[PDB]
Every structure is written in C-alpha cells, then in structure tokens.
Design an enzyme around this catalytic site. Structure first.
Site, PDB file in Angstrom:
ATOM      1  CG  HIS A 127      -0.128   0.024   2.521  1.00 41.47           C
ATOM      2  ND1 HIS A 127       0.280  -1.127   3.159  1.00 41.47           N
ATOM      3  CD2 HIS A 127       0.374   1.055   3.245  1.00 41.47           C
ATOM      4  CE1 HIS A 127       0.977  -0.805   4.237  1.00 41.47           C
ATOM      5  NE2 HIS A 127       1.056   0.513   4.301  1.00 41.47           N
ATOM      6  CG  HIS A 173       1.554   5.516   4.269  1.00 41.47           C
ATOM      7  ND1 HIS A 173       0.528   5.403   5.175  1.00 41.47           N
ATOM      8  CD2 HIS A 173       2.194   4.318   4.275  1.00 41.47           C
ATOM      9  CE1 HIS A 173       0.553   4.197   5.727  1.00 41.47           C
ATOM     10  NE2 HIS A 173       1.556   3.522   5.191  1.00 41.47           N
ATOM     11  CG  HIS A 180       4.858   1.145   4.085  1.00 38.11           C
ATOM     12  ND1 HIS A 180       4.078   1.834   4.986  1.00 38.11           N
ATOM     13  CD2 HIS A 180       6.063   1.770   4.080  1.00 38.11           C
ATOM     14  CE1 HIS A 180       4.769   2.829   5.505  1.00 38.11           C
ATOM     15  NE2 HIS A 180       5.986   2.810   4.973  1.00 38.11           N
TER      16      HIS A 180
END
Ligand SMILES: NS(=O)(=O)c1nnc(-c2ccccc2Cl)s1
Ligand SMILES: [Zn+2]
Length: 257
Positions: free
Chosen positions: A91, A93, A116
């Site tokens: 995923h 950020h 990540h």
C-alpha cells in the site's frame, strides 16, 4: 473511528491504542549521519518471481494490492532477517502536496509518498499470529519522489478510478511488484511498529536508500481517491501518513557505507 483528520488523526490514536506511545513506534526520522554502517548485515533477498496478486482495495485509509500468501511465492529474507517472510500486501502513504507524504524521513526530508511492502514471518503461520510477535513482520519501505514516471506503477494508477471510495475493491491479477523496486537494495533497518492502528510493535523495518521516481500524473491519481464511502461527503484521501515518532532506545543500522 481513527483516521487522519483533525479530530481522529495520529495525535488521537493513543486513546484507542495506548501502544502509540510505546518504546518502538514507527515511522522515525532516519538521521543518516547517526545511522551506523553494519558490515555484518547481509544483502536483502527479494524473491518476487512467483508473486500472485489477487485484488486491489480501498480500505478507507489507503489502497492496497493483496497477494496470495498461502505458499512461499513472494518472499523476503536475508538482510537483517532470520527466516522467511511472505508478502501479503503493499500500500502507499502520500501527501496533499509533493513536499510531504512519506512516513519515514531522511535527515528530516519528506518524500512525496512511501510504498510499504508488508511481509509476515512464516514461522508464525498467519498474519494475525505474526503481528503479536516482536519479529512477526518485515516491512520493506520505498520512498517516492516526483519526476519521471515509473512504468511499473502505471497498471496500479489506471485502476484507481474503480476503487474511489472506502470499501471498493477490484480484481487485480498478474501484477508484478518487481516493477516498483529501485536499482539498489541498500537499506536502513531498525525495530519498529505498524504505522496504522493497532500500531503493534512487530515490525523489522527495512527502508531502501534509493527512492523511485513517479510522475506528477501518477501521484495526482492517488490524490483523487476518497477516505469516505460512496454517498458520504467527499474527503480526498491525502496526507494519510503518520509523522515521525520518538526514536527512544533504538539504533538505525545501514547496510552500506
Ligand atoms: N503502514 S504499515 O505497513 O506499517 C502497516 N500498518 N498496519 C498494517 C496492518 C494493520 C492491520 C492489520 C494488518 C496489517 Cl498488515 S500494515
Ligand atoms: Zn504503511
């Protein structure tokens, strides 16, 4: 209830998850001058040749691509790790602007985003058991900066319009995560935690020195996603990053001089 807004963001998390103020919380600022070169550290071994992606999902906090982790198909080992860690998902950020978005920072510098890749230690059998162990997870962190496009990321950004809101998912097969890796596997490593609730202190962090470059158009598509579910007031999914936490009693080691 938790999120990234003024009333439910990172400064609020400790109320539901007291470990937020724990001794090995992530992310952290990586002070490159203080990180010590450790010649005993091995090269990272990333074996993703047989990776099987399954679905892509907006979970209300990020979007994630999930893999089949029922066999040793996509595994991380070596580096600072003992044993073998299976890839379950990746995923991102990211920020509302290019000057913020990453969770880890390098000499206080923020990148536009951070990828990540989440792996769990096979000796614990499943992810749920793994997160309750101090060596249960290995997360590979890769910084994103804005410049040239990353061709390997394009198949991901092209499907984001189909998972705009919380709870939406889509078939996402035959995606090759090798297309998201930079040239060098030189890394920093330290003991840390999940950066979203439940914030469990179960992670060996491995953060690559070399960022990947993505295009402004690619990151722009990240920023069109929504925190909210369909039919709720539209709140753009931006700034879904936890800021750097106290390093406390920890040493960051470098695999490189
Ligand atoms: N951002 S991160 O990779 O440290 C991460 N934080 N939480 C994660 C998680 C949360 C809940 C269930 C399973 C997992 Cl893997 S993964
Ligand atoms: Zn993350």
């Amino acid at each position: 209830h938790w999120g990234y807004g003024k009333h439910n963001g990172p400064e609020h998390w400790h109320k539901d998850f007291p470990i937020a103020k724990g001794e090995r919380q992530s992310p952290v600022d990586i002070d490159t001058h203080t990180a010590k070169y450790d010649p005993s550290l091995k090269p990272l071994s990333v074996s993703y040749d047989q990776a099987t992606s399954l679905r892509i999902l907006n979970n209300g906090h990020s979007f994630q691509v999930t893999f089949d982790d029922s066999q040793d198909k996509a595994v991380l080992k070596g580096g600072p790790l003992d044993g073998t860690y299976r890839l379950i998902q990746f995923h991102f950020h990211w920020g509302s602007l290019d000057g913020q978005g990453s969770e880890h920072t390098v000499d206080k510098k923020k990148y536009a985003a951070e990828l990540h890749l989440v792996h769990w230690n096979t000796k614990y059998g499943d992810l749920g058991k793994a997160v309750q162990q101090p060596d249960g997870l290995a997360v590979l962190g890769i910084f994103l900066k804005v410049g040239s496009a990353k061709p390997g990321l394009q198949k991901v950004v092209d499907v984001l319009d189909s998972i705009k809101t919380e709870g939406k998912s889509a078939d996402f097969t035959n995606f090759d995560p090798r297309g998201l890796l930079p040239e060098s596997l030189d890394y920093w490593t330290y003991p840390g935690s999940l950066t979203t609730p439940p914030l469990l202190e179960c992670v060996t962090w491995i953060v690559l020195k070399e960022p990947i470059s993505v295009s402004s158009e690619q990151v722009l598509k990240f920023r069109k996603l929504n925190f909210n579910g369909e039919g709720e007031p539209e709140e753009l999914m931006v700034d879904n990053w936890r800021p750097a936490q106290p390093l406390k009693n920890r040493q960051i080691k470098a695999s490189f001089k």
